[PDB]
Amino acid sequence: KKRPEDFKFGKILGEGSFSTVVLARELATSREYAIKILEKRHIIKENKVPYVTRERDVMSRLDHPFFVKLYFTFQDDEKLYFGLSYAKNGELLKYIRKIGSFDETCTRFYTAEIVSALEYLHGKGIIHRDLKPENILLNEDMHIQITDFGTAKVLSPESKQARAQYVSPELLTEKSACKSSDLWALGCIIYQLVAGLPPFRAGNEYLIFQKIIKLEYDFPEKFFPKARDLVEKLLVLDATKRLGCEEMEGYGPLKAHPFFESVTWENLHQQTPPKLTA
Ligand SMILES: O=C(N[C@@H](COc1ccc2[nH]c(=O)[nH]c2c1)c1ccccc1)c1cccn(Cc2ccc(F)c(F)c2)c1=O
């Protein structure tokens, strides 16, 4: 078992739900991990601290190339520690501030990795509920690493549902989430990769929420036609009519959409990602 003294702790990578993720270097190996630290003082019923109880065991057991993984755990008198994948290259959409919108080859590749990751997650009955560019990190090899900050939920077999710019209308109109809520988020992400901006934009959050529920958005003139078609098929108010959803025959029709022509879905993790720039 590892212990706190085996690492040199660096900067904070992220924080939420009484959990702080810190960059750490393993002294013996020079390997870097993102170690999540929870103070035992905060583990009380009223706080609903994630990853302490059994309801997230299926998430903790994931061993997929596109999700940050749990490698080890340990504890001391005051804290719980969870060693997670470190995604060296940070947030995927961070390149937009320099480079602007992604080209079709790069959009197709990164969209395929996200779709492949969501298919796997949904196949385990897990819904993310807060999928956004901030949660799509990139490792040293430039492959995606999707993070959860305690929003993901395992659905029960008895229900296909569970209780701003990337939020689906059902999370706004009926305060519920389903697998299809994540496909709405995917539609927003694809649009942002291509356009360089998210689809629902307005003067403030209140107005953005109105645009979402009314489907008030437009495409710029330069939007790749196959990507436009795909986005229109994901950004549908009725959650049962989104491409990829259970009621629309699942992932096959989504992975077979013309936007994904030439994609080799089985080896995306082994392919060299296309460079965003030389
Ligand atoms: O513990 C897990 N995730 C952490 C966040 O992990 C981070 C955050 C930033 C980082 N930067 C970097 O380089 N590595 C980083 C790791 C968490 C924080 C706060 C509350 C709850 C969880 C965590 C534990 C186990 C598995 N996963 C992957 C996962 C689970 C369910 C999903 F639906 C999903 F899409 C992905 C986790 O995110």
PDB file of C-alpha atoms and ligand atoms in Angstrom:
ATOM      1  CA  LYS A   1       0.000   0.000   0.000  1.00  0.00           C
ATOM      2  CA  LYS A   2       1.091   3.542  -0.804  1.00  0.00           C
ATOM      3  CA  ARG A   3       1.148   6.359   1.743  1.00  0.00           C
ATOM      4  CA  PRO A   4       1.133  10.220   1.683  1.00  0.00           C
ATOM      5  CA  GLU A   5       4.951  10.313   2.266  1.00  0.00           C
ATOM      6  CA  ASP A   6       5.493   8.403  -1.026  1.00  0.00           C
ATOM      7  CA  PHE A   7       4.518  11.568  -2.937  1.00  0.00           C
ATOM      8  CA  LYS A   8       5.521  15.179  -3.454  1.00  0.00           C
ATOM      9  CA  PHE A   9       2.254  17.137  -3.671  1.00  0.00           C
ATOM     10  CA  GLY A  10       2.022  20.003  -6.141  1.00  0.00           C
ATOM     11  CA  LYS A  11      -0.774  22.343  -7.324  1.00  0.00           C
ATOM     12  CA  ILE A  12      -4.563  21.936  -7.075  1.00  0.00           C
ATOM     13  CA  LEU A  13      -5.978  20.489 -10.311  1.00  0.00           C
ATOM     14  CA  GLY A  14      -9.615  20.773  -9.301  1.00  0.00           C
ATOM     15  CA  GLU A  15     -12.088  20.859  -6.455  1.00  0.00           C
ATOM     16  CA  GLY A  16     -15.677  20.025  -5.704  1.00  0.00           C
ATOM     17  CA  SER A  17     -17.921  18.214  -3.253  1.00  0.00           C
ATOM     18  CA  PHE A  18     -15.486  18.310  -0.264  1.00  0.00           C
ATOM     19  CA  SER A  19     -12.817  16.678  -2.512  1.00  0.00           C
ATOM     20  CA  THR A  20      -9.613  18.396  -3.709  1.00  0.00           C
ATOM     21  CA  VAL A  21      -7.611  16.967  -6.628  1.00  0.00           C
ATOM     22  CA  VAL A  22      -3.872  17.662  -6.317  1.00  0.00           C
ATOM     23  CA  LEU A  23      -1.066  16.966  -8.751  1.00  0.00           C
ATOM     24  CA  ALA A  24       1.448  14.602  -7.100  1.00  0.00           C
ATOM     25  CA  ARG A  25       4.698  12.993  -8.102  1.00  0.00           C
ATOM     26  CA  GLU A  26       5.475   9.494  -6.813  1.00  0.00           C
ATOM     27  CA  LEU A  27       8.996   9.889  -5.295  1.00  0.00           C
ATOM     28  CA  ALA A  28      10.237   6.382  -6.125  1.00  0.00           C
ATOM     29  CA  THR A  29       9.164   6.379  -9.814  1.00  0.00           C
ATOM     30  CA  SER A  30       8.680  10.060 -10.948  1.00  0.00           C
ATOM     31  CA  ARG A  31       5.168   8.996 -12.125  1.00  0.00           C
ATOM     32  CA  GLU A  32       2.539  11.727 -11.762  1.00  0.00           C
ATOM     33  CA  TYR A  33      -0.989  11.170 -10.491  1.00  0.00           C
ATOM     34  CA  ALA A  34      -3.951  13.431  -9.772  1.00  0.00           C
ATOM     35  CA  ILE A  35      -4.596  12.534  -6.100  1.00  0.00           C
ATOM     36  CA  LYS A  36      -8.067  13.302  -4.758  1.00  0.00           C
ATOM     37  CA  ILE A  37      -8.014  14.163  -1.031  1.00  0.00           C
ATOM     38  CA  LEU A  38     -11.104  14.037   1.247  1.00  0.00           C
ATOM     39  CA  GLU A  39     -10.938  15.127   4.869  1.00  0.00           C
ATOM     40  CA  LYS A  40     -12.617  12.571   7.165  1.00  0.00           C
ATOM     41  CA  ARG A  41     -14.170  15.509   9.147  1.00  0.00           C
ATOM     42  CA  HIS A  42     -16.437  16.163   6.103  1.00  0.00           C
ATOM     43  CA  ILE A  43     -17.728  12.574   5.784  1.00  0.00           C
ATOM     44  CA  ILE A  44     -21.086  13.101   7.505  1.00  0.00           C
ATOM     45  CA  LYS A  45     -24.589  12.326   6.140  1.00  0.00           C
ATOM     46  CA  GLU A  46     -25.599  15.954   5.485  1.00  0.00           C
ATOM     47  CA  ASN A  47     -22.587  16.511   3.179  1.00  0.00           C
ATOM     48  CA  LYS A  48     -23.346  13.671   0.630  1.00  0.00           C
ATOM     49  CA  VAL A  49     -19.583  13.385  -0.162  1.00  0.00           C
ATOM     50  CA  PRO A  50     -19.227  11.305  -3.381  1.00  0.00           C
ATOM     51  CA  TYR A  51     -17.106   8.123  -3.726  1.00  0.00           C
ATOM     52  CA  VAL A  52     -17.304   7.199  -0.025  1.00  0.00           C
ATOM     53  CA  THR A  53     -20.370   4.941  -0.204  1.00  0.00           C
ATOM     54  CA  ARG A  54     -21.131   1.949  -2.417  1.00  0.00           C
ATOM     55  CA  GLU A  55     -23.314   3.668  -5.039  1.00  0.00           C
ATOM     56  CA  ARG A  56     -20.302   4.636  -7.157  1.00  0.00           C
ATOM     57  CA  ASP A  57     -18.457   1.265  -7.064  1.00  0.00           C
ATOM     58  CA  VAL A  58     -19.185   0.649 -10.813  1.00  0.00           C
ATOM     59  CA  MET A  59     -17.556   4.069 -11.545  1.00  0.00           C
ATOM     60  CA  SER A  60     -14.565   3.275  -9.307  1.00  0.00           C
ATOM     61  CA  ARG A  61     -14.066  -0.059 -11.173  1.00  0.00           C
ATOM     62  CA  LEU A  62     -13.951   1.486 -14.702  1.00  0.00           C
ATOM     63  CA  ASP A  63     -10.772   0.513 -16.576  1.00  0.00           C
ATOM     64  CA  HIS A  64     -11.320   2.345 -19.897  1.00  0.00           C
ATOM     65  CA  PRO A  65      -8.787   4.304 -21.999  1.00  0.00           C
ATOM     66  CA  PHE A  66     -11.104   7.356 -22.186  1.00  0.00           C
ATOM     67  CA  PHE A  67     -11.916   7.956 -18.501  1.00  0.00           C
ATOM     68  CA  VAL A  68      -9.616   9.005 -15.673  1.00  0.00           C
ATOM     69  CA  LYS A  69      -8.890   5.787 -13.698  1.00  0.00           C
ATOM     70  CA  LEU A  70      -8.564   5.019  -9.979  1.00  0.00           C
ATOM     71  CA  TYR A  71      -5.121   3.380  -9.434  1.00  0.00           C
ATOM     72  CA  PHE A  72      -4.832   3.270  -5.635  1.00  0.00           C
ATOM     73  CA  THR A  73      -6.315   4.415  -2.349  1.00  0.00           C
ATOM     74  CA  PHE A  74      -4.903   5.007   1.130  1.00  0.00           C
ATOM     75  CA  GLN A  75      -5.714   6.910   4.288  1.00  0.00           C
ATOM     76  CA  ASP A  76      -4.087   8.601   7.298  1.00  0.00           C
ATOM     77  CA  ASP A  77      -5.678   9.871  10.568  1.00  0.00           C
ATOM     78  CA  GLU A  78      -7.385  12.801   8.936  1.00  0.00           C
ATOM     79  CA  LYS A  79      -7.787  12.079   5.218  1.00  0.00           C
ATOM     80  CA  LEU A  80      -8.752   9.670   2.427  1.00  0.00           C
ATOM     81  CA  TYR A  81      -6.579   9.678  -0.748  1.00  0.00           C
ATOM     82  CA  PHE A  82      -7.501   8.387  -4.219  1.00  0.00           C
ATOM     83  CA  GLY A  83      -4.858   8.173  -6.919  1.00  0.00           C
ATOM     84  CA  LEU A  84      -6.321   9.109 -10.308  1.00  0.00           C
ATOM     85  CA  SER A  85      -5.051   9.473 -13.881  1.00  0.00           C
ATOM     86  CA  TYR A  86      -3.210  12.765 -14.484  1.00  0.00           C
ATOM     87  CA  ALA A  87      -4.161  14.297 -17.847  1.00  0.00           C
ATOM     88  CA  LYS A  88      -1.000  16.249 -18.702  1.00  0.00           C
ATOM     89  CA  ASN A  89      -2.476  18.327 -21.551  1.00  0.00           C
ATOM     90  CA  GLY A  90      -5.465  19.690 -19.622  1.00  0.00           C
ATOM     91  CA  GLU A  91      -8.832  20.687 -21.146  1.00  0.00           C
ATOM     92  CA  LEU A  92      -9.410  19.651 -24.796  1.00  0.00           C
ATOM     93  CA  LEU A  93     -11.206  22.890 -25.779  1.00  0.00           C
ATOM     94  CA  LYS A  94      -8.345  25.095 -24.337  1.00  0.00           C
ATOM     95  CA  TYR A  95      -6.799  25.113 -27.903  1.00  0.00           C
ATOM     96  CA  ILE A  96      -9.776  27.174 -29.224  1.00  0.00           C
ATOM     97  CA  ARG A  97      -8.445  30.366 -27.504  1.00  0.00           C
ATOM     98  CA  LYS A  98      -5.304  30.179 -29.677  1.00  0.00           C
ATOM     99  CA  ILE A  99      -6.251  28.140 -32.765  1.00  0.00           C
ATOM    100  CA  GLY A 100      -9.975  28.793 -32.907  1.00  0.00           C
ATOM    101  CA  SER A 101     -12.403  26.162 -34.141  1.00  0.00           C
ATOM    102  CA  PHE A 102     -11.201  22.645 -34.960  1.00  0.00           C
ATOM    103  CA  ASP A 103     -10.959  21.345 -38.526  1.00  0.00           C
ATOM    104  CA  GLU A 104     -13.177  18.448 -39.727  1.00  0.00           C
ATOM    105  CA  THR A 105     -10.496  15.710 -39.229  1.00  0.00           C
ATOM    106  CA  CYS A 106      -9.860  16.761 -35.600  1.00  0.00           C
ATOM    107  CA  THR A 107     -13.559  17.320 -34.829  1.00  0.00           C
ATOM    108  CA  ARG A 108     -14.340  13.817 -36.237  1.00  0.00           C
ATOM    109  CA  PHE A 109     -11.582  12.171 -34.212  1.00  0.00           C
ATOM    110  CA  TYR A 110     -12.306  13.796 -30.843  1.00  0.00           C
ATOM    111  CA  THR A 111     -16.097  13.481 -31.330  1.00  0.00           C
ATOM    112  CA  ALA A 112     -15.562   9.713 -32.049  1.00  0.00           C
ATOM    113  CA  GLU A 113     -13.531   9.337 -28.797  1.00  0.00           C
ATOM    114  CA  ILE A 114     -16.336  11.098 -26.797  1.00  0.00           C
ATOM    115  CA  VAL A 115     -19.044   8.963 -28.465  1.00  0.00           C
ATOM    116  CA  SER A 116     -17.010   5.756 -27.768  1.00  0.00           C
ATOM    117  CA  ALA A 117     -16.579   6.841 -24.090  1.00  0.00           C
ATOM    118  CA  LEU A 118     -20.359   7.692 -23.665  1.00  0.00           C
ATOM    119  CA  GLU A 119     -21.359   4.370 -25.260  1.00  0.00           C
ATOM    120  CA  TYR A 120     -19.183   2.494 -22.706  1.00  0.00           C
ATOM    121  CA  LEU A 121     -20.459   4.584 -19.748  1.00  0.00           C
ATOM    122  CA  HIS A 122     -24.139   4.186 -20.856  1.00  0.00           C
ATOM    123  CA  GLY A 123     -23.533   0.419 -21.370  1.00  0.00           C
ATOM    124  CA  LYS A 124     -22.698   0.232 -17.598  1.00  0.00           C
ATOM    125  CA  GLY A 125     -25.930   2.151 -16.812  1.00  0.00           C
ATOM    126  CA  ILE A 126     -23.953   5.282 -15.790  1.00  0.00           C
ATOM    127  CA  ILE A 127     -25.113   8.765 -16.827  1.00  0.00           C
ATOM    128  CA  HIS A 128     -22.709  11.699 -16.498  1.00  0.00           C
ATOM    129  CA  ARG A 129     -25.354  14.487 -15.998  1.00  0.00           C
ATOM    130  CA  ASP A 130     -22.757  17.330 -16.365  1.00  0.00           C
ATOM    131  CA  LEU A 131     -20.817  16.610 -19.522  1.00  0.00           C
ATOM    132  CA  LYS A 132     -18.982  19.720 -20.692  1.00  0.00           C
ATOM    133  CA  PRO A 133     -15.592  20.652 -22.238  1.00  0.00           C
ATOM    134  CA  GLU A 134     -14.129  21.242 -18.729  1.00  0.00           C
ATOM    135  CA  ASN A 135     -14.691  17.520 -18.063  1.00  0.00           C
ATOM    136  CA  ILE A 136     -12.877  16.382 -21.245  1.00  0.00           C
ATOM    137  CA  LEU A 137      -9.154  16.363 -20.511  1.00  0.00           C
ATOM    138  CA  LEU A 138      -6.278  15.182 -22.683  1.00  0.00           C
ATOM    139  CA  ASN A 139      -3.461  12.891 -21.586  1.00  0.00           C
ATOM    140  CA  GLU A 140       0.178  13.088 -22.791  1.00  0.00           C
ATOM    141  CA  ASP A 141      -0.723  10.952 -25.848  1.00  0.00           C
ATOM    142  CA  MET A 142      -3.506  13.446 -26.745  1.00  0.00           C
ATOM    143  CA  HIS A 143      -6.332  10.938 -26.106  1.00  0.00           C
ATOM    144  CA  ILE A 144      -9.349  12.064 -24.078  1.00  0.00           C
ATOM    145  CA  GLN A 145      -9.683  11.480 -20.299  1.00  0.00           C
ATOM    146  CA  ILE A 146     -13.235  12.228 -19.101  1.00  0.00           C
ATOM    147  CA  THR A 147     -13.618  13.322 -15.447  1.00  0.00           C
ATOM    148  CA  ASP A 148     -16.637  13.139 -13.084  1.00  0.00           C
ATOM    149  CA  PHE A 149     -16.902  15.680 -10.192  1.00  0.00           C
ATOM    150  CA  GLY A 150     -19.643  13.735  -8.364  1.00  0.00           C
ATOM    151  CA  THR A 151     -22.538  14.279 -10.861  1.00  0.00           C
ATOM    152  CA  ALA A 152     -22.455  10.845 -12.518  1.00  0.00           C
ATOM    153  CA  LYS A 153     -25.181   8.411 -11.446  1.00  0.00           C
ATOM    154  CA  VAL A 154     -25.866   4.716 -11.868  1.00  0.00           C
ATOM    155  CA  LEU A 155     -29.419   4.113 -13.091  1.00  0.00           C
ATOM    156  CA  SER A 156     -31.559   1.393 -11.463  1.00  0.00           C
ATOM    157  CA  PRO A 157     -33.063  -1.171 -13.968  1.00  0.00           C
ATOM    158  CA  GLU A 158     -36.507   0.084 -12.817  1.00  0.00           C
ATOM    159  CA  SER A 159     -35.968   3.542 -14.391  1.00  0.00           C
ATOM    160  CA  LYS A 160     -34.385   5.148 -17.423  1.00  0.00           C
ATOM    161  CA  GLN A 161     -34.328   8.505 -15.471  1.00  0.00           C
ATOM    162  CA  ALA A 162     -32.707   9.991 -12.402  1.00  0.00           C
ATOM    163  CA  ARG A 163     -33.179  13.444 -10.759  1.00  0.00           C
ATOM    164  CA  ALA A 164     -25.714  26.068 -17.769  1.00  0.00           C
ATOM    165  CA  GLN A 165     -24.628  26.317 -21.468  1.00  0.00           C
ATOM    166  CA  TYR A 166     -24.524  22.499 -21.898  1.00  0.00           C
ATOM    167  CA  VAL A 167     -27.668  21.598 -19.867  1.00  0.00           C
ATOM    168  CA  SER A 168     -30.490  19.688 -21.582  1.00  0.00           C
ATOM    169  CA  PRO A 169     -34.151  20.955 -21.613  1.00  0.00           C
ATOM    170  CA  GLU A 170     -35.304  17.992 -19.370  1.00  0.00           C
ATOM    171  CA  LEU A 171     -32.865  19.018 -16.653  1.00  0.00           C
ATOM    172  CA  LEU A 172     -34.551  22.495 -16.938  1.00  0.00           C
ATOM    173  CA  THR A 173     -38.260  21.611 -17.647  1.00  0.00           C
ATOM    174  CA  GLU A 174     -38.682  18.339 -15.710  1.00  0.00           C
ATOM    175  CA  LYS A 175     -35.564  18.322 -13.413  1.00  0.00           C
ATOM    176  CA  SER A 176     -34.702  14.789 -14.617  1.00  0.00           C
ATOM    177  CA  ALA A 177     -31.678  13.301 -16.421  1.00  0.00           C
ATOM    178  CA  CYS A 178     -31.354  10.238 -18.648  1.00  0.00           C
ATOM    179  CA  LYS A 179     -28.701   8.799 -21.043  1.00  0.00           C
ATOM    180  CA  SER A 180     -30.111  11.123 -23.721  1.00  0.00           C
ATOM    181  CA  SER A 181     -29.254  14.202 -21.492  1.00  0.00           C
ATOM    182  CA  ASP A 182     -25.581  13.321 -22.157  1.00  0.00           C
ATOM    183  CA  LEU A 183     -26.275  13.140 -25.946  1.00  0.00           C
ATOM    184  CA  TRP A 184     -27.676  16.693 -25.772  1.00  0.00           C
ATOM    185  CA  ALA A 185     -24.383  17.772 -24.062  1.00  0.00           C
ATOM    186  CA  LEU A 186     -22.489  15.920 -26.842  1.00  0.00           C
ATOM    187  CA  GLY A 187     -24.425  17.975 -29.457  1.00  0.00           C
ATOM    188  CA  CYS A 188     -23.362  21.209 -27.714  1.00  0.00           C
ATOM    189  CA  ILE A 189     -19.707  20.026 -27.577  1.00  0.00           C
ATOM    190  CA  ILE A 190     -19.584  19.056 -31.273  1.00  0.00           C
ATOM    191  CA  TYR A 191     -21.111  22.465 -32.142  1.00  0.00           C
ATOM    192  CA  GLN A 192     -18.441  24.241 -30.003  1.00  0.00           C
ATOM    193  CA  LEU A 193     -15.557  22.305 -31.608  1.00  0.00           C
ATOM    194  CA  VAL A 194     -16.768  23.324 -35.095  1.00  0.00           C
ATOM    195  CA  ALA A 195     -18.047  26.892 -34.431  1.00  0.00           C
ATOM    196  CA  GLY A 196     -15.579  27.866 -31.683  1.00  0.00           C
ATOM    197  CA  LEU A 197     -18.486  28.935 -29.438  1.00  0.00           C
ATOM    198  CA  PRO A 198     -21.291  27.000 -27.693  1.00  0.00           C
ATOM    199  CA  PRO A 199     -24.741  27.013 -29.464  1.00  0.00           C
ATOM    200  CA  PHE A 200     -26.925  28.651 -26.777  1.00  0.00           C
ATOM    201  CA  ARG A 201     -25.556  32.174 -26.134  1.00  0.00           C
ATOM    202  CA  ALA A 202     -27.296  35.226 -24.666  1.00  0.00           C
ATOM    203  CA  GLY A 203     -26.883  38.223 -22.328  1.00  0.00           C
ATOM    204  CA  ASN A 204     -27.071  36.116 -19.138  1.00  0.00           C
ATOM    205  CA  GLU A 205     -27.864  32.641 -17.745  1.00  0.00           C
ATOM    206  CA  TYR A 206     -31.584  33.361 -17.407  1.00  0.00           C
ATOM    207  CA  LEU A 207     -31.745  34.122 -21.179  1.00  0.00           C
ATOM    208  CA  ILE A 208     -29.516  31.136 -22.132  1.00  0.00           C
ATOM    209  CA  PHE A 209     -31.982  28.808 -20.297  1.00  0.00           C
ATOM    210  CA  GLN A 210     -34.840  30.278 -22.379  1.00  0.00           C
ATOM    211  CA  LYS A 211     -32.912  29.718 -25.647  1.00  0.00           C
ATOM    212  CA  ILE A 212     -32.288  26.042 -24.654  1.00  0.00           C
ATOM    213  CA  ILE A 213     -35.938  25.306 -23.881  1.00  0.00           C
ATOM    214  CA  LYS A 214     -37.047  27.045 -27.104  1.00  0.00           C
ATOM    215  CA  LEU A 215     -34.212  25.585 -29.244  1.00  0.00           C
ATOM    216  CA  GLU A 216     -33.082  29.093 -30.259  1.00  0.00           C
ATOM    217  CA  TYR A 217     -29.726  28.689 -31.999  1.00  0.00           C
ATOM    218  CA  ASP A 218     -28.276  28.893 -35.504  1.00  0.00           C
ATOM    219  CA  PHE A 219     -25.270  27.551 -37.324  1.00  0.00           C
ATOM    220  CA  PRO A 220     -22.475  29.786 -38.725  1.00  0.00           C
ATOM    221  CA  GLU A 221     -22.029  29.689 -42.528  1.00  0.00           C
ATOM    222  CA  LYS A 222     -18.728  27.670 -42.362  1.00  0.00           C
ATOM    223  CA  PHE A 223     -20.164  24.758 -40.316  1.00  0.00           C
ATOM    224  CA  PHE A 224     -19.252  21.332 -41.825  1.00  0.00           C
ATOM    225  CA  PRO A 225     -22.495  20.065 -43.466  1.00  0.00           C
ATOM    226  CA  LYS A 226     -22.225  16.518 -42.034  1.00  0.00           C
ATOM    227  CA  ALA A 227     -21.493  17.928 -38.546  1.00  0.00           C
ATOM    228  CA  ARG A 228     -24.495  20.318 -38.884  1.00  0.00           C
ATOM    229  CA  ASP A 229     -26.776  17.329 -39.681  1.00  0.00           C
ATOM    230  CA  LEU A 230     -25.410  15.385 -36.695  1.00  0.00           C
ATOM    231  CA  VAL A 231     -25.847  18.332 -34.302  1.00  0.00           C
ATOM    232  CA  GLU A 232     -29.484  18.817 -35.479  1.00  0.00           C
ATOM    233  CA  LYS A 233     -30.100  15.146 -34.705  1.00  0.00           C
ATOM    234  CA  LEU A 234     -28.685  15.495 -31.127  1.00  0.00           C
ATOM    235  CA  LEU A 235     -30.090  18.954 -30.230  1.00  0.00           C
ATOM    236  CA  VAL A 236     -33.725  17.721 -30.135  1.00  0.00           C
ATOM    237  CA  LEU A 237     -36.073  18.902 -27.326  1.00  0.00           C
ATOM    238  CA  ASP A 238     -37.708  15.447 -26.989  1.00  0.00           C
ATOM    239  CA  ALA A 239     -35.043  13.264 -25.236  1.00  0.00           C
ATOM    240  CA  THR A 240     -36.469  10.084 -26.890  1.00  0.00           C
ATOM    241  CA  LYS A 241     -35.729  11.460 -30.391  1.00  0.00           C
ATOM    242  CA  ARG A 242     -31.951  12.080 -30.054  1.00  0.00           C
ATOM    243  CA  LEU A 243     -29.618  10.077 -32.293  1.00  0.00           C
ATOM    244  CA  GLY A 244     -27.883   7.479 -30.106  1.00  0.00           C
ATOM    245  CA  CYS A 245     -30.708   7.194 -27.535  1.00  0.00           C
ATOM    246  CA  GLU A 246     -32.364   3.888 -26.537  1.00  0.00           C
ATOM    247  CA  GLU A 247     -35.682   4.776 -28.217  1.00  0.00           C
ATOM    248  CA  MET A 248     -33.797   5.601 -31.501  1.00  0.00           C
ATOM    249  CA  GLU A 249     -32.119   2.138 -31.529  1.00  0.00           C
ATOM    250  CA  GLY A 250     -29.005   3.092 -29.547  1.00  0.00           C
ATOM    251  CA  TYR A 251     -25.406   3.762 -30.579  1.00  0.00           C
ATOM    252  CA  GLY A 252     -25.268   1.988 -33.948  1.00  0.00           C
ATOM    253  CA  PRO A 253     -27.169   4.674 -35.943  1.00  0.00           C
ATOM    254  CA  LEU A 254     -25.098   7.373 -34.178  1.00  0.00           C
ATOM    255  CA  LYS A 255     -21.701   5.718 -34.904  1.00  0.00           C
ATOM    256  CA  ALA A 256     -22.926   5.064 -38.507  1.00  0.00           C
ATOM    257  CA  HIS A 257     -23.841   8.721 -39.128  1.00  0.00           C
ATOM    258  CA  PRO A 258     -22.110  10.084 -42.332  1.00  0.00           C
ATOM    259  CA  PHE A 259     -20.121  12.549 -40.181  1.00  0.00           C
ATOM    260  CA  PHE A 260     -18.110   9.487 -38.909  1.00  0.00           C
ATOM    261  CA  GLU A 261     -17.170   8.167 -42.400  1.00  0.00           C
ATOM    262  CA  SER A 262     -13.777   6.326 -42.294  1.00  0.00           C
ATOM    263  CA  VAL A 263     -13.754   6.033 -38.458  1.00  0.00           C
ATOM    264  CA  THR A 264     -12.301   2.740 -37.134  1.00  0.00           C
ATOM    265  CA  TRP A 265     -14.253   2.643 -33.855  1.00  0.00           C
ATOM    266  CA  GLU A 266     -12.477  -0.385 -32.352  1.00  0.00           C
ATOM    267  CA  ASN A 267      -8.943   1.082 -32.204  1.00  0.00           C
ATOM    268  CA  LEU A 268      -9.385   4.844 -31.540  1.00  0.00           C
ATOM    269  CA  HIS A 269      -7.284   4.523 -28.332  1.00  0.00           C
ATOM    270  CA  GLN A 270      -4.407   3.010 -30.413  1.00  0.00           C
ATOM    271  CA  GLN A 271      -4.508   5.557 -33.243  1.00  0.00           C
ATOM    272  CA  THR A 272      -2.215   8.565 -33.219  1.00  0.00           C
ATOM    273  CA  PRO A 273      -4.614  11.560 -32.671  1.00  0.00           C
ATOM    274  CA  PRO A 274      -4.505  14.109 -35.581  1.00  0.00           C
ATOM    275  CA  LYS A 275      -2.399  17.150 -34.520  1.00  0.00           C
ATOM    276  CA  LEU A 276      -4.500  20.272 -33.932  1.00  0.00           C
ATOM    277  CA  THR A 277      -1.536  22.247 -35.487  1.00  0.00           C
ATOM    278  CA  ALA A 278       1.998  21.317 -36.710  1.00  0.00           C
TER     279      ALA A 278
HETATM  280  O1  LIG B   1     -12.683  10.592  -8.305  1.00  0.00           O
HETATM  281  C1  LIG B   1     -12.997  10.788  -9.485  1.00  0.00           C
HETATM  282  N1  LIG B   1     -13.068  12.026 -10.088  1.00  0.00           N
HETATM  283  C2  LIG B   1     -12.715  13.247  -9.334  1.00  0.00           C
HETATM  284  C3  LIG B   1     -12.202  14.243 -10.356  1.00  0.00           C
HETATM  285  O2  LIG B   1     -11.027  13.657 -10.958  1.00  0.00           O
HETATM  286  C4  LIG B   1     -10.171  14.507 -11.586  1.00  0.00           C
HETATM  287  C5  LIG B   1     -10.379  15.934 -11.791  1.00  0.00           C
HETATM  288  C6  LIG B   1      -9.390  16.660 -12.487  1.00  0.00           C
HETATM  289  C7  LIG B   1      -8.306  15.989 -12.939  1.00  0.00           C
HETATM  290  N2  LIG B   1      -7.242  16.552 -13.667  1.00  0.00           N
HETATM  291  C8  LIG B   1      -6.361  15.509 -13.939  1.00  0.00           C
HETATM  292  O3  LIG B   1      -5.319  15.661 -14.585  1.00  0.00           O
HETATM  293  N3  LIG B   1      -6.913  14.317 -13.403  1.00  0.00           N
HETATM  294  C9  LIG B   1      -8.098  14.630 -12.789  1.00  0.00           C
HETATM  295  C10 LIG B   1      -9.012  13.840 -12.113  1.00  0.00           C
HETATM  296  C11 LIG B   1     -13.760  13.851  -8.383  1.00  0.00           C
HETATM  297  C12 LIG B   1     -13.553  15.156  -7.801  1.00  0.00           C
HETATM  298  C13 LIG B   1     -14.545  15.664  -6.929  1.00  0.00           C
HETATM  299  C14 LIG B   1     -15.665  14.904  -6.571  1.00  0.00           C
HETATM  300  C15 LIG B   1     -15.866  13.616  -7.113  1.00  0.00           C
HETATM  301  C16 LIG B   1     -14.896  13.087  -8.036  1.00  0.00           C
HETATM  302  C17 LIG B   1     -13.284   9.645 -10.361  1.00  0.00           C
HETATM  303  C18 LIG B   1     -13.190   8.405  -9.793  1.00  0.00           C
HETATM  304  C19 LIG B   1     -13.332   7.194 -10.561  1.00  0.00           C
HETATM  305  C20 LIG B   1     -13.670   7.302 -11.907  1.00  0.00           C
HETATM  306  N4  LIG B   1     -13.754   8.566 -12.510  1.00  0.00           N
HETATM  307  C21 LIG B   1     -14.038   8.601 -13.943  1.00  0.00           C
HETATM  308  C22 LIG B   1     -15.458   8.798 -14.259  1.00  0.00           C
HETATM  309  C23 LIG B   1     -16.531   8.299 -13.407  1.00  0.00           C
HETATM  310  C24 LIG B   1     -17.891   8.451 -13.822  1.00  0.00           C
HETATM  311  C25 LIG B   1     -18.095   9.124 -15.063  1.00  0.00           C
HETATM  312  F1  LIG B   1     -19.355   9.276 -15.481  1.00  0.00           F
HETATM  313  C26 LIG B   1     -17.050   9.591 -15.846  1.00  0.00           C
HETATM  314  F2  LIG B   1     -17.275  10.197 -17.002  1.00  0.00           F
HETATM  315  C27 LIG B   1     -15.722   9.455 -15.461  1.00  0.00           C
HETATM  316  C28 LIG B   1     -13.632   9.781 -11.834  1.00  0.00           C
HETATM  317  O4  LIG B   1     -13.744  10.890 -12.347  1.00  0.00           O
END
